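Hi all, long-time lurker, first post. I run a small reading group and we've been trying to get comfortable going from sequence to structure in the token notation. Rather than ask abstract questions, I figured I'd post a concrete chain and ask someone more experienced to write out its structure so we can walk through it together at our next meeting. Sequence below, copied exactly:
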Amino acid sequence: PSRIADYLLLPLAHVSRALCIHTGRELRCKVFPIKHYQDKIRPYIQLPSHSNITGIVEVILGETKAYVFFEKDFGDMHSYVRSRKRLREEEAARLFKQIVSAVAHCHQSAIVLGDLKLRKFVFSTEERTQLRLESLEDALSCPAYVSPEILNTTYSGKAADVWSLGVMLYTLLVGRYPFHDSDPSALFSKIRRGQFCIPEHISPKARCLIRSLLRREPSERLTAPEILLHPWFESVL
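-- Answer (accepted) --
Happy to help. Here is the structure in token form:
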């Protein structure tokens, strides 16, 4: 029952529906206190573009509050791979590169994500060819995306994000997590011991990549920029 700037705000059922009063077209809007934006969200706005990595079209800063307007997504990547059992290497490589590129771009602007999951990547279009980051805090089935460093102890974080990328890469190709168990002690021991098995239908270049992203030792893992050069991508695309 409300409005700011170009947009009427309609409920759903902490985000809401934004309808542009000029064009008529529907976006989404999430309000924050201005200082939460300044701290936790303004870093993503500083990205060079920004509107491709995140879905954000414009933000409006008042005296008191920040209104972040973004384009609506067409479902997350966890629901996707779950819905498809697993992904063929051709599509998996397309989608993963976008994921890595977004992450690589963030790392270059000093942003460490920390909360990297398949959940965090959402389709920008109805065709579901193109992903963006879900930057705004909005059976397979932490844990699993959690790395040997944080259990043992400070650490990089950027390397920790590459671990998560490795878990994500394994998971879309394989269809389940690299580490999984009924007993959690066993789960965390297998994390800390870097202990997993790749299937044989997975191809040598693809296996090669997963291995180089999932290393106990953080320094020995690739960086997000390095990842994008790896031959797996070019072998299928």
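A couple of things your group might point at:
Residues 73 and 124 are 5 Å apart (CA to CA).
Residues 1-72 form a domain with the Phosphorylase Kinase; domain 1 fold (CATH 3.30.200.20).
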